Design an enzyme around this catalytic site. Structure first.
Site, mmCIF file in Angstrom:
data_model
loop_
_atom_site.group_PDB
_atom_site.id
_atom_site.type_symbol
_atom_site.label_atom_id
_atom_site.label_comp_id
_atom_site.label_asym_id
_atom_site.label_seq_id
_atom_site.Cartn_x
_atom_site.Cartn_y
_atom_site.Cartn_z
ATOM 1 N N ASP A 97 22.143 -12.898 -23.871
ATOM 2 C CA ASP A 97 23.356 -13.445 -23.221
ATOM 3 C C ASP A 97 24.076 -14.333 -24.213
ATOM 4 O OD1 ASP A 97 24.820 -13.844 -20.435
ATOM 5 O OD2 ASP A 97 24.796 -15.786 -21.536
ATOM 6 N N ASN A 145 18.114 -16.862 -21.179
ATOM 7 C CA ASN A 145 19.048 -16.017 -21.944
ATOM 8 C C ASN A 145 18.343 -15.084 -22.911
ATOM 9 O OD1 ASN A 145 21.338 -17.028 -20.661
ATOM 10 N ND2 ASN A 145 21.375 -18.879 -21.966
HETATM 11 C C1 LIG Z 1 9.030 -7.158 -12.311
HETATM 12 N N1 LIG Z 1 10.327 -7.237 -13.068
HETATM 13 C C2 LIG Z 1 10.284 -6.268 -14.151
HETATM 14 C C3 LIG Z 1 11.600 -6.456 -14.935
HETATM 15 N N2 LIG Z 1 12.705 -6.275 -14.039
HETATM 16 C C4 LIG Z 1 13.981 -6.275 -14.776
HETATM 17 C C5 LIG Z 1 14.094 -5.373 -15.845
HETATM 18 C C6 LIG Z 1 15.317 -5.317 -16.567
HETATM 19 C C7 LIG Z 1 16.293 -6.230 -16.267
HETATM 20 C C8 LIG Z 1 17.623 -6.213 -17.066
HETATM 21 O O1 LIG Z 1 18.688 -6.539 -16.593
HETATM 22 N N3 LIG Z 1 17.505 -5.729 -18.304
HETATM 23 C C9 LIG Z 1 18.510 -5.689 -19.278
HETATM 24 N N4 LIG Z 1 18.413 -4.786 -20.252
HETATM 25 N N5 LIG Z 1 19.493 -5.007 -21.104
HETATM 26 C C10 LIG Z 1 20.246 -6.010 -20.611
HETATM 27 C C11 LIG Z 1 21.391 -6.678 -21.115
HETATM 28 C C12 LIG Z 1 22.038 -7.741 -20.510
HETATM 29 C C13 LIG Z 1 21.448 -8.237 -19.284
HETATM 30 C C14 LIG Z 1 22.045 -9.444 -18.624
HETATM 31 C C15 LIG Z 1 21.028 -10.572 -18.786
HETATM 32 C C16 LIG Z 1 20.789 -11.179 -20.049
HETATM 33 C C17 LIG Z 1 19.809 -12.191 -20.153
HETATM 34 F F1 LIG Z 1 19.624 -12.760 -21.339
HETATM 35 C C18 LIG Z 1 19.047 -12.603 -19.062
HETATM 36 C C19 LIG Z 1 19.261 -11.979 -17.863
HETATM 37 F F2 LIG Z 1 18.471 -12.356 -16.786
HETATM 38 C C20 LIG Z 1 20.221 -10.944 -17.704
HETATM 39 C C21 LIG Z 1 20.292 -7.612 -18.780
HETATM 40 C C22 LIG Z 1 19.680 -6.534 -19.448
HETATM 41 C C23 LIG Z 1 16.199 -7.103 -15.152
HETATM 42 N N6 LIG Z 1 17.230 -7.916 -14.871
HETATM 43 C C24 LIG Z 1 17.229 -9.020 -13.899
HETATM 44 C C25 LIG Z 1 16.661 -10.242 -14.566
HETATM 45 C C26 LIG Z 1 16.405 -11.318 -13.484
HETATM 46 C C27 LIG Z 1 17.835 -11.723 -13.178
HETATM 47 O O2 LIG Z 1 17.755 -12.818 -12.203
HETATM 48 C C28 LIG Z 1 18.601 -10.569 -12.463
HETATM 49 C C29 LIG Z 1 18.649 -9.399 -13.469
HETATM 50 C C30 LIG Z 1 14.978 -7.137 -14.442
HETATM 51 C C31 LIG Z 1 12.754 -7.294 -12.949
HETATM 52 C C32 LIG Z 1 11.479 -6.975 -12.170
#
Ligand SMILES: CN1CCN(c2ccc(C(=O)Nc3n[nH]c4ccc(Cc5cc(F)cc(F)c5)cc34)c(N[C@H]3CC[C@H](O)CC3)c2)CC1
Length: 293
Positions: free
Chosen positions: A171, A155
């Protein structure tokens, strides 16, 4: 039309910053999970994350999404993701959040473990700065009488992968659900949570487990034990061993967060002091992290 109360102040749907739809463009999918579903987007240009609500959804789903927007919009702290605004008057509905390009903390830890190909990818100081970042967010929640109820690496988000990354709580789903079983975060919960009364000492407990996640570089807590095995284990006095190479003073922070009695656990101001101390101790910060071969 629900109201939401925080820090003595009441707010409702009309208090959310509704951003005209035409001002919002989705750039790419980022993923889905317990947190819902999220995209990279742009506003107006401001880069954001965009959480979406399925068009095919229940009435409670709608009320849940509204309450999520209310909760996040009312916090005001550098270690809790900001809400830029919402788009609730067009479908599918959107909540616009601060873009956190480093993604979630648990994945970052697993992916950035030192290896022979990247042997200094992280150092103790990087881990203590993440711990401090999230402790500062938690201290804000504690001081505003808000119990998070699922402090865990999954989170937490990071601003960027590289040097200068800031961790933030990303989260508030569990808190939203209680504002108002197999899904309960049992491995993060203290014995007393099984009278079921929560306090910010229940979040202290959870923060100790998050500290174990951080200093283990993204392992699941209680390796090999199921939820019920954990419950019986912790209730009996059982505690995780230190993560591999964990400095004693950092492990002592975990073990104080896991005191059986809640009054014996530190508040987040004390946790911060103790993280600051570890951060200044050369023997802690000069300790090498394990190489995952
Ligand atoms: C190599 N790696 C570089 C980073 N990249 C990113 C970057 C930004 C993000 C991303 O969503 N950035 C956010 N920026 N601002 C946000 C606000 C709320 C959320 C939802 C959320 C909150 C949390 F605490 C944890 C989460 F995984 C997802 C997400 C974000 C990302 N998201 C994935 C996380 C893994 C999950 O299983 C699916 C969503 C992945 C993933 C690939």
């Amino acid at each position: 039309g629900p109201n939401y109360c925080f820090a003595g102040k009441t707010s409702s749907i009309s208090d959310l910053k509704e951003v005209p739809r035409k001002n919002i463009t989705l750039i790419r999918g980022l993923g889905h999970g317990a947190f819902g579903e999220v995209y990279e987007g742009q506003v107006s240009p401001l880069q954001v994350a965009v959480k979406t609500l399925p068009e095919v959804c229940s009435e409670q789903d709608e009320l849940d999404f509204l309450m999520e927007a209310l909760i996040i919009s009312k916090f005001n702290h550098q270690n809790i993701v900001r809400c830029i605004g919402v788009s609730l008057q067009s479908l599918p509905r959107f909540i616009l959040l601060e873009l956190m390009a480093g993604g979630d903390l648990k994945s970052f830890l697993r992916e950035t473990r030192p290896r022979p190909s990247q042997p200094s990818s992280l150092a103790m100081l990087d881990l203590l700065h993440v711990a401090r970042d999230i402790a500062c967010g938690c201290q804000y929640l504690e001081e505003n009488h808000f119990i998070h109820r699922d402090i865990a690496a999954r989170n937490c988000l990071l601003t960027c992968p590289g040097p200068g990354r800031v961790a933030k709580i990303g989260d508030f789903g569990m808190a939203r659900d209680i504002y108002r079983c197999a899904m309960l975060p049992v491995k993060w919960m203290p014995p007393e949570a099984f009278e079921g009364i929560f306090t910010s000492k229940t979040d202290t407990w959870s923060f100790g487990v998050l500290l174990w996640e951080i200093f283990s570089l993204g392992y699941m807590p209680y390796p090999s034990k199921s939820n019920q095995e954990v419950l019986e284990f912790v209730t009996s006095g059982g505690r995780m061993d230190p993560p591999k190479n964990c400095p004693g003073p950092v492990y002592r922070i975990m073990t104080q967060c896991w005191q059986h009695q809640p009054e014996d656990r530190p508040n987040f101001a004390i946790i911060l002091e103790r993280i600051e101390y570890c951060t200044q101790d050369p023997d802690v910060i000069n300790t090498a992290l394990p190489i995952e071969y």
